[PDB]
Design a protein around this ligand. Structure first.
Ligand SMILES: Nc1ncnc2c1ncn2[C@@H]1O[C@H](COP(=O)(O)OP(=O)(O)OP(=O)(O)O)[C@@H](O)[C@H]1O
Ligand SMILES: Nc1ncnc2c1ncn2[C@@H]1O[C@H](COP(=O)(O)OP(=O)(O)OP(=O)(O)O)[C@@H](O)[C@H]1O
Ligand SMILES: [Co+2]
Ligand SMILES: [Mg+2]
Ligand SMILES: [Mg+2]
Ligand SMILES: [Mg+2]
Ligand SMILES: [Mg+2]
Lengths: 768, 768, 193, 192
C-alpha cells in the first residue's frame, strides 16, 4: 500500500492553467486538480488565460476553493480560459511570469494543454534556475528567495483535440470531438437521395491525422487524407476509381474524410475544394463539402473525456507532490488503461521528430513515430476500406462463422462488419449465424459477403440477432450443424453468456470433435462484466446515455426549488455503469452491489447531501445499480431521500431502462468493435494456418479464449484460466479494476473516503 | 352541405409528383402523403425522379408508385425521388420534350414540390401547355386527337425549400428543420466555456431571403443580424462593434452574429462573413470564430412540425388537384394561420419577383413589407429585444407589471418571460417577477427583474422563474395583499390550463378584492395544448419533437429477423393532441386517445389490422396511447393485448415517455413562439394601462382579463369569460379541438378506411 | 388462485363455488373467447344473477393477467355491473389443515412407512427403491419415479394427463354454457366389493 | 390496516393482537424512530419471541409505505428473521357483523328514531340536526355545527382522539419505555 491521506501536500501551493485551443474535458480536469489538491491539504490557484495570465499576473491568478470548480463537469471549454500567449515565446515573458509565480509562492505547476503548451512548459523548467538569477540580479526578487523557490515541480496533461503530443496514447478532448464529427456524418446519412452523393468532410488536426483516421473508420469512409501517410502520386484518378467502384456496390453515399494538414508525397496541401472538383469533374456526383469548424470543440464533453480528465487530475496532483528537486518534469497520461508519467523533454522531442520526419518526406517514419496504435488503426482502416479483387486473394477453403451471443450491445454490428471483411480479405468463406445459439441450433446459418455488412459500423442493436440461450442443452445439434456446414473456427461477439458459452463448448470438445477448433470471444455488453477485459463494446455508449440524461436533468430550471434525482442504471450486478456514470455525471452517491450498504450508511449519505442542498448545490444526483440490493430498491431510496429532504428539496425518480441500449453506438464503440473484431479474426486466421490446410484438431487450452483489455494490452486469455478469477454467482469478475476509482468519486462529492492510490502512475520512458 | 373524401373519387386520373430544387427535410413526408392519398381516392400516382430533369429525360425516370413505395420514409431527410436543377427545362426544347413524356404516360395532373424557382417554372409550363401540344402534334410526335384529350393541365404546388423565398406563403416545408440544424450548432457553442470574450459569426442560408437569418437570430438572442431586406445603415461597422462591447459590459461573454448568405448594405454590396470577422478582430480583438453552416442545414431528420405540415399539404394538393376544373387557376397549397388555403400560382410568382425588384432598386422598406405582415413583425420584435435604448430615452410609466409562471413546466416559458420582461422595460414599466407561481405569489416571493437578468433565457428549458399548478382560489386574501403592497398594476401569466382557471377565479374576485382590477393576459404554455382559445401552446412543439425523436431511434435499431411493435404512452392528460399529432408525425398505426372512445372490438380490429401489416410489408410497428384515453384499457392492457395477439408474428415493447422529457431545451419553434406572443401580450398591457391614464382605471370588465391565443387565422385576445362556453372543465380540454379533423388522415395513411370530413379543405384565395 | 400452472385449484374451486368461468393454463384462450364469456356473464347479470364470479389461475396466461381480465370485464360491464378484484395470495396456504387433509396426511404417511419397513426388512440401486406413493387407478400404489417422467411436463411442472380436466365441461354447462362433455368415463353397473 | 388517516384500527388492533409497533398517522415518525423499533424487535426475535408483529395504518405516511417498512425490517432482520407482508384490504369490510356491532347498530338506531319521533311532536334551528354518538359517558345528540370546531377536515379525523391515551400502554406492554399520561385513570365512585 501507499494511500492518498498518507501523502499530505500541506504547505504546498499548486497553480493550474489551461493553454492552447480549448478542448472538452478541460473543466473536468481542473475540477479534479482543484479538489484533489484541496483535499490533500494543498492550496491550489487558478491561472486564467493559460500562459498569458501567468505573464500578466495580478488578478489573473486567484486562489480556488471547493466551490470554484462546482458544476463544471458537463461543461465544454474551460472556465479558466485558454489562449495563446506570444509573450511567453520570449525570454522577457518567461521572466515576467516566473516573477508573478514567485510573488505568490507557487512552485508547483499543472499545465493542461497540447503539444505546444507542454513543450513551452518543458522549456520554462529548464530556464527556471536561469530566470531566478536574472530576477535576483535585477533586484525584482529576494536574494534568498532564489533558494527557496528553487525547485519547479511541473506536470502536464495533454488536453487538445489534436492528439499531436507524441509519446502519449489518448488525450482529453478527442473522444468529444469525435462525437461532434460523427454526429454530423450521422445527420447526413439519415438523408435519402435517389442519385449518387459524395460528402467531403474536413476534420481537424494541424499536422496530425489521428482525428481524421479514427473519424474514417468510425463511419467506414471511402477514403482518407492523412499528413502521415499521404496519397501516392496519381491518386486523383485512383480515388475517383474507388468511388465509382463503391458506387457499383450499391453504396449510394461516399464519404471522404480530409485532415486539415492533408498533403501529398511532396508536402503540397491537398485542399478539400480540390477534392470537390475532382469528383464533380470526373464522376459528376452530387458533391457537398463542409469544413467542420471550431464546432468540434463544442457540445458537452463525452463520458470518456470526463472520466479520463478526472483520473488525470488526480494523477497530476499526486505526481506533483511526490516530485523531488531532481525528478524530471513529466506528463501524466494513460497507457492501456494504466496511469503513467512520461518525462516532458522525451515527449516534446519525439513530437518534434514526427514533424521533422514529415517535412523530410520520410512518411513511413512519421507513421511509426505516432505510435503502435496509430499504425495499426491505419492498417485496419485500409484493410476494411480497400478490398482486393477476388482473384488476388488466395482462398483458404475454411468456413469461419461469426455469431452474436448475449444481450444486445451498441456496436455488435460494427464488430461483425469488421470480422466478416477481415475474414474475406484473409481468404476465408464467412458464415453468419443468426439469433445467437438459439438460431445456431435451429440451423439458421448463411454466408455473408463483403458488401452485405456495408454501413453496419454505425448501426445499433444486432443486425445478426442475439440471444441469451447457452449451448449446454443443445451441444448435439450444434455439433451437427458445425459438421454439416464444415465450420473451422468460431468468433463470438457477445457478453457474459458468450463466455459461459465458450466454457461449455471447451468441455464438450471432449465428447465432440466438431468443437476442437479455434474460438475467440469479443466482449460486448453495456454491463462491462466479461471476465478478462477491462472494457466492453457498448459500455461507452451506455455511459454516454447516462451523462446525457443527467445533463438535461440539470439544465432544466425548477425556480427556487432544490431538486434531487435518483437514477437507476443497468448492469445487472456489475456496478460499472452506475459507478463510472456517477463519476462522470458528478453524483453525490452511487449505490452498487460490489459495495454493500445498510440503513445507517444510507441515512448518512442523505444527511450529507441534504446539507449540500441547503447551501452550495441547487441540483443533486444519486445513481443506483439495478441489483445493488433487493430490499433497498430504487423506490425505497427514492422514498427515503424524499422524506428526509422534505422542506429542503424534493425528489424525482427515474429508471433509464433498457430502451437506451439499442441507440446508435458512440464513436468510441464503433471503433472499439471494429478494432478487436479485427484482431480476433487475425488470430483465427493464424490458428488455421497451424492446420497447414489439411485441418488440425485444436485441443490446446489457449485455442478457446477471450480477447480483452488486460494489463496494458489486448491479450488473448484462455477461458479456462479465467474461471479462477470470476464469480459465477453474480456473473462479474472477482477483481474489478474500476473499483479503485470509487473512493475518488466520493471525495469529489465532498466525502472523506480512504483512497488506495497504490495503482497510481510512475515514471516511464516513451516506448519506441 | 359537407364534403367527404371517399365521395370525391379520382378514379381514371393519373397524378405525377416530383421534387425539384434543393432538397428540404419533409419532402418525403410530402410525397408519402400525395402517393397514398392519391392511391386512396382511386387515382394512380407516378414518381418523377430528379425533378424536372427526370421529366425531360422521361423513360424510366417516370415509374408508377404503389402504397409501399413511400413506406417508411417519413423520418427521412432529403427526397427518395431525388431533386435537382434542370437546365433543359429553362429552354423551350426542354418543356417540349417533357410535355411529350408526360403525354406518353397519360399524366395530365401534376404535383410539383419545390421552391420559388420550381414553382415559377411550373407556372410557365402551364401557360405554354396548349402551345407545346401544338408544336408536338405539328411535328408528328403526338397524336392529332391527343392534343384535345390531354388538353387540360392540372398543376398544384407545395413550397418545399429551406429558403422560404416564395411570396405569399407563411411557412414552407423544411424551414423548421433547417432552424433545428442551425440552433443545434449555436447551442453546441453556448455550452462551451471560455474566460475571455468570444464572438461567434454564423452564416445561415437564404439566397436573397433573410427569413432564416431572422428567426435564427431571435431563436438565440443574437447580438446582430444581417438581412437582405433591411440592410445595415451606412456606418454600421462602428455601430456593430459598439454594440458588441456594450453587451460585453453587460456580462454577455459570447456574442453571436447571424449573417444571411445574401447579406448586403444600403447599396447592394455583399457583406461577407469574413469582413465581419476582421471587423471585430481588428476593432475589439475578441476571440472570433466563424462557420459557414453549409448544406448541413438540409441534413438531419425532418422536425415534427415539418412532417405534419408536409402531410397536411400532401392531402390539400390531391383534393385541390381533383376539384380542379379546366378554368381553375393553377394554385399553390399553403397554410394561413393554421388554416389550409390555395393561392393562384401567378399571383405568388409575381410578388416573389417584386420583392427581388424592390431590393435591387434599394427600396428596402418595400421589400420588408412585401415579405409579409409576419416577417415585418418578427423583424421589429427582434430589434426591440436586441437593441435597448438608454434609460433616459425611455419615458417611464410608473407602472409595475408583474410576470408569473403557472401550471406544469413547458419548454419555452423562459423565452416567454425574457420577451415579456424586456418589452415591458422598453415600454417604460417597472418589471416584477413572481416566483414559484401562485404558491410563491401568496408567500410574497416577488422581486424586480432587469433587462440583463433575463439574458440568454431564450434557449433555456424548464422555468427559471419557477412554476406551480396551485390555484389562487384558497389564497385570494393573501395574493391581493401582495399586489397591494407591491403595487402591481398589470399581470401577465405564462402557463397552461390551470393558468386559465386562475384567471377565471381572479375575475370573480375583482368584485370583493379591488386589487384585481388591473389588466391580466394569459399566454398558452403547456405540452398538452389544451388551453381554451388557442390552437397552439408554448412547449407543444418541443414535446412533439421529443416523441418523433424517440420513435426515430426505436426504428433505426435492428432486431434481426424479428418483427417488433412498440406501444408508447404520451403526455397530455385528457388532450390527445400530443398522442394524435405525434402519431401522425411518427407514422403510427393507431393512436388511442380520450376524445375518440373505443371498446375491445375496435381494439381487437386494430390489432388484427396491424398484425397483418407485420406479416408482410412492415418490419417495425408503432402504437401511441394518450395518458388518460381510458382507465381500464391502460398502457399495459394494450401492451398485453397486442403482445398476445402478435405471438408468433411479432413481439412487443412498452415505453412510457414520462414527464422527464418535459424539461429539456425548447425547440426553435417554441423559443420563438414564446418570444412572439409574450411580446404581443405585453404590447396589449401597455396599451390598456395607458387608457387607464385617460379612459379610466375601470378594469372591472371581462375584456380586461384575456387569453392571447391562436384562433381563426390570427392571434386574438379573447376574454376568459366567453371561453367558458366552449370548454369542458371536467377533462380540462376545449369542447372543439381543431386537430381532430386530421385524425381520419392519420388513419387512412396507416391503410385504414376512415370517413374523412374534408369540408375545411382549402379554397382559392388571393394573397394579402 | 394459486397452483402455478396447475389449474386444479382454479377449476375445482370454480366448480365448488359456482363460477361463471375459470381461466386456466391447461385450456388456452384468446381475446375472442374472453370477449364471449364477458358477454355471456353480462347477460346473466342483466337478469337472473345478482352476484357474478370469475376465477383465474396464477399463470394461466402471462399477457392476460388478473388485472387484464379485471379491466376487460370492468369496461364491458360498465352500466350493468361493477368489478372487484381479489388475489387470494399465499398467505392462506399456512392456515390450519382441513379435516380431510389431516386424515389424508395421516393415512398415506402411514402406508408409506409400512412400505419402508417392509423394504428395509429385505436387506437398493434398482428403480423401485425410489417411488411416489399416490392415488392412481383406484388405489394408492407406489410408482417408481423413473416411469413417471414419461407422463410429466417438466416445463410447467404439471402431469401430462390431468384427470380432473374431464370435469371441466361439467362446470361449464352448469354455468349455462354449451360445452361438449366427454362422458365416457361415466360409471357403469358393478358389484359391491 | 384500513382507517384512512384514523389509526384507530391500527392502534387498537395492535394492542389487541399484541404487536411490537403500530405505525399511525396521528403520531409522526422518521427513519430514526423506524430504525430504533427494528433494532428493538430484532433483539426480541433473537431471544424471547418466535413470531413478531407490526401493524401499519393505510395512510400513516406517503413515503414510508407498507412495502418500505417491509423492505426495511426485511433487510435489518437478514440473518435473524424473515418478513412477510400482508395487506388486509377492503375485502374484509363486508363480512358478517360481529355480535357487538349488530347490537350497537340496533341500539343507537333505535335511540335516534326515538329522537326523531319526539322532534316531530312539534325546523330551521341548529340543534335539530345532530349526530348521535358516544361522548362523555353517554350517548348524546350533538349539533353538527358545534362539532366543526373539534374536527380536522383535511384528514377527516376528530382533533382529539380518546384512544390515543392508550397508545403508550400498547408500547410498554411491548417492552418499550413510553411516557404514560395516566391522568384519565379511574377514581373511587359509588355504584349508581
Ligand atoms: N516553443 C514554445 N516556447 C514557449 N512557449 C510555447 C512554445 N510552444 C507553445 N508555447 C506556449 O503555448 C501557447 C500556444 O501554443 P499551441 O497552440 O502550440 O498550444 P497547444 O496546446 O498545442 O494548442 P492546441 O490546443 O490547438 O493543440 C504559445 O502561445 C505559448 O505560450
Ligand atoms: N423561370 C424558370 N423557367 C423554367 N424553369 C424554372 C424557372 N425557374 C426555375 N425553374 C426550374 O427549377 C429548377 C431549379 O431552380 P431553383 O433552384 O430556383 O428551384 P428552387 O425550388 O427555388 O430551389 P431551392 O429549394 O434551393 O430554393 C430549374 O433548373 C428549373 O428546372
Ligand atoms: Co527511416
Ligand atoms: Mg490545448
Ligand atoms: Mg497544438
Ligand atoms: Mg427545393
Ligand atoms: Mg429557391
Amino acid at each position: 500500500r501507499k494511500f492518498l491521506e498518507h501523502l499530505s501536500g500541506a504547505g504546498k501551493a499548486i497553480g493550474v492553467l489551461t493553454s492552447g485551443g480549448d478542448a472538452q474535458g478541460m473543466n473536468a480536469a481542473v475540477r479534479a486538480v482543484v479538489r484533489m489538491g484541496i483535499y490533500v491539504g494543498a492550496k491550489v490557484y487558478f491561472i486564467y488565460e493559460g500562459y498569458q495570465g501567468m505573464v500578466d499576473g495580478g488578478s489573473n491568478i486567484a486562489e480556488a476553493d471547493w466551490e470554484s470548480v462546482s458544476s463544471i463537469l458537463q461543461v465544454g471549454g474551460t472556465i479558466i480560459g485558454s489562449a495563446r500567449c506570444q509573450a511567453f515565446r520570449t525570454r522577457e515573458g518567461r521572466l515576467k511570469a516566473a516573477c508573478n509565480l514567485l510573488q505568490r509562492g507557487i512552485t508547483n505547476l499543472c499545465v493542461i494543454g497540447g503539444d505546444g503548451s507542454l513543450t513551452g512548459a518543458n522549456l520554462f523548467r529548464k530556464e527556471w534556475s536561469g530566470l531566478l538569477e536574472e530576477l535576483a540580479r535585477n533586484g525584482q526578487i529576494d536574494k534568498e528567495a532564489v533558494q527557496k523557490y528553487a525547485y519547479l515541480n511541473v506536470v502536464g496533461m495533454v488536453g487538445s483535440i489534436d492528439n499531436d503530443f507524441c509519446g502519449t496514447d489518448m488525450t482529453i478532448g478527442t473522444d468529444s470531438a469525435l462525437h461532434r464529427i460523427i454526429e454530423v456524418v450521422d445527420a447526413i446519412m439519415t438523408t435519402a437521395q435517389s442519385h449518387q452523393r459524395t460528402f467531403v468532410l474536413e476534420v481537424m488536426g494541424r499536422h496530425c491525422g489521428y482525428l481524421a483516421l479514427v473519424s474514417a473508420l468510425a463511419c467506414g469512409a471511402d477514403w482518407v487524407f492523412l499528413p502521415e501517410s499521404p496519397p501516392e502520386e496519381g491518386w486523383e484518378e485512383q480515388m475517383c476509381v474507388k468511388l465509382s467502384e463503391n458506387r457499383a456496390r450499391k453504396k449510394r453515399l461516399n464519404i471522404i474524410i480530409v485532415a486539415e494538414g492533408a498533403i501529398d508525397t511532396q508536402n503540397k496541401p491537398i485542399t478539400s475544394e480540390k477534392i470537390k472538383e475532382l469528383v464533380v469533374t470526373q464522376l459528376g456526383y452530387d458533391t457537398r463539402v463542409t469544413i467542420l469548424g471550431h464546432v468540434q470543440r463544442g457540445g458537452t464533453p463525452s463520458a470518456f473525456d470526463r472520466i479520463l480528465a478526472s483520473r488525470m487530475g488526480v494523477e497530476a496532483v499526486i505526481a506533483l507532490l511526490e516530485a523531488t528537486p531532481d525528478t524530471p518534469a513529466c506528463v501524466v497520461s494513460l497507457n492501456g488503461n494504466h496511469a503513467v508519467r512520461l518525462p516532458l523533454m522525451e515527449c516534446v522531442q519525439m513530437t518534434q521528430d514526427v514533424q521533422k520526419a514529415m517535412d523530410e518526406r520520410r512518411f513511413q517514419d512519421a507513421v511509426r513515430l505516432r505510435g503502435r496504435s496509430f499504425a495499426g488503426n491505419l492498417n485496419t482502416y485500409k484493410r476494411l476500406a480497400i478490398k482486393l479483387p477476388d482473384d488476388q486473394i488466395p482462398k483458404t477453403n475454411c468456413n469461419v462463422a461469426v455469431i452474436n451471443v448475449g444481450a444486445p450491445a451498441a456496436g455488435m454490428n460494427a464488430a461483425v462488419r469488421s470480422a466478416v471483411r477481415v475474414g474475406i480479405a484473409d481468404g476465408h468463406r464467412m458464415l453468419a449465424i443468426y439469433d445467437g445459439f438459439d438460431g445456431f441450433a435451429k440451423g439458421q446459418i448463411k454466408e455473408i459477403g463483403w458488401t452485405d455488412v456495408g454501413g453496419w459500423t454505425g448501426q445499433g442493436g444486432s443486425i445478426l440477432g442475439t440471444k441469451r440461450v447457452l449451448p449446454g442443452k443443445y451441444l448435439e445439434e450444434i455439433a451437427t450443424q458445425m459438421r454439416t456446414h464444415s465450420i473451422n473456427a468460431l468468433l463470438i461477439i457477445g457478453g457474459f453468456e458468450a463466455y459461459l458459452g465458450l466454457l461449455e463448448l471447451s468441455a464438450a470438445r471432449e465428447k465432440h470433435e466438431e468443437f476442437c477448433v479455434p474460438m475467440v470471444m469479443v466482449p460486448a455488453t453495456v454491463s462491462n462484466n466479461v471476465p478478462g477485459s477491462d472494457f466492453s463494446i457498448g459500455a461507452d455508449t451506455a455511459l454516454n446515455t447516462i451523462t446525457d440524461t443527467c445533463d438535461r436533468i440539470k439544465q432544466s430550471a425548477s425556480g427556487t426549488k432544490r431538486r434531487v434525482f435518483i437514477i437507476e442504471t443497468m448492469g445487472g450486478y456489475c456496478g460499472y455503469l452506475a459507478n463510472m456514470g456517477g463519476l462522470a455525471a458528478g453524483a453525490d452517491a452511487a449505490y452498487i452491489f460490489e459495495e454493500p450498504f445498510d440503513i445507517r450508511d444510507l441515512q448518512s449519505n442523505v444527511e450529507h447531501l441534504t446539507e449540500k442542498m441547503k447551501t452550495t448545490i441547487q441540483r443533486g444526483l444519486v445513481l443506483r445499480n439495478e441489483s445493488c440490493s433487493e430490499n433497498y430498491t430504487t423506490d425505497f431510496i427514492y422514498q427515503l431521500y424524499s422524506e428526509e429532504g422534505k422542506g429542503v428539496f424534493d425528489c424525482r425518480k427515474n429508471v433509464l431502462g433498457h430502451m437506451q441500449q439499442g441507440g446508435a453506438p458512440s464513436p468510441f464503440d464503433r471503433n472499439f468493435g471494429t478494432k478487436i473484431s479485427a484482431r480476433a479474426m487475425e488470430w483465427i486466421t493464424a490458428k488455421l494456418k497451424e492446420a497447414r490446410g489439411r485441418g488440425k484438431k485444436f485441443t490446446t487450452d489457449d485455442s478457446i479464449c477471450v480477447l480483452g483489455i488486460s494489463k496494458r494490452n489486448v491479450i488473448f486469455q484462455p477461458v479456462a484460466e479465467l474461471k479462477k478469477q470470476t464469480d459465477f454467482e453474480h456473473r462479474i469478475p472477482k477483481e474489478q479494476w474500476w473499483l479503485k476509482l470509487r473512493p475518488l468519486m466520493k471525495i469529489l462529492a465532498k466525502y472523506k473516503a480512504s483512497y488506495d492510490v497504490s495503482d497510481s502512475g510512475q515514471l516511464e520512458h516513451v516506448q519506441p
